[PDB]
Ligand SMILES: Nc1ncnc2c1ncn2[C@@H]1O[C@H](COP(=O)(O)OP(=O)(O)NP(=O)(O)O)[C@@H](O)[C@H]1O
Ligand SMILES: O=P(O)(O)O[C@@H]1[C@@H](O)[C@@H](O)[C@@H](OP(=O)(O)O)[C@H](OP(=O)(O)O)[C@H]1O
């Protein structure tokens with residue numbers, strides 16, 4: 001029905017118009033959604049209708065991706081081998097912002113993960129925290145990770161920080177689709193068509209795509225959709241340089257491994273389909 005329905009049952013706000021949702025405006029994301037409405041990827045992303053002012057603050061007017069669905073099941077998949085901007089590595093070297101919260105969140109999962117100095121600081125840098133998160137999840141090895149699942153009653157889970165192996169990921173999607181062969185076939189058809197669109201997209205070859213997700217939505221009527229969301233960390237390459245989105249990331253090359261992720265994701269769903 002609507003995302004705000006689930007939020008009720010915080011960058012998001014209810015829109016006045018039916019089938020729309022408001023997201024806190026960010027300059028990079030607004031720039032990206034405007035470009036995307038004129039790109040090959042237009043149909044692979046939520047409709048962007050412009051910006052509205054609400055309680056003296058700027059909001060993106062977006063398609064509510066849950067509108068078409070009757071009690072939607074939702075899975076958010078963060079795409080890429082790298083999940084932070086290269087500029088974070090520079091800031092952490094010249095002027096580190098020590099994060100006590102990120103130390104705690106790290107300590108919780110692996111008490112041996114922090115260094116002697118991090119233990120002394122009770123704090124880590126963001127890039128260090130994000131690189132650690134990439135390695136204990138599937139991000140580093142498969143180029144994506146499951147972030148959360150969110151059904152319509154309100155039953156939700158974010159308990160996937162150590163979902164890392166191909167077979168672990170397959171079992172999460174297995175549980176998500178609950179043996180619905182039609183939903184899985186539709187998901188795979190949609191991902192195949194998204195990969196084809198990304199491989200010809202003028203936007204995609206010219207932009208570093210960090211921290212974006214694929215949103216999987218299905219319902220008990222076997223309706224299934226997938227969209228790219230969250231362009232808040234998607235930035236243009238300088239002087240007409242391009243990415244292949246498959247080759248390994250090395251500081252300076254701005255590679256995101258987005259298509260390495262999508263290739264592996266398609267391979268896992270295709271594997272599940274044959275079980
Ligand atoms: N257009 C949309 N329609 C419906 N639901 C949406 C839409 N965009 C986002 N959502 C939901 O909101 C969640 C967060 O979206 P996202 O764009 O990643 O926001 P964010 O504030 O950047 N969150 P995060 O990346 O986790 O720090 C998604 O996982 C969906 O469940
Ligand atoms: O709690 P988690 O999931 O272990 O870590 C989150 C991470 O998932 C992501 O939401 C990140 O925001 P980003 O993608 O850079 O916009 C957050 O960073 P920050 O706290 O907002 O700096 C970081 O904490």
Ligand SMILES: [Mn+2]
Pocket residue numbers: 211212213229230
């Ligand atoms: Mn996001």
Ligand SMILES: [Mn+2]
Pocket residue numbers: 211230232
């Ligand atoms: Mn985000």
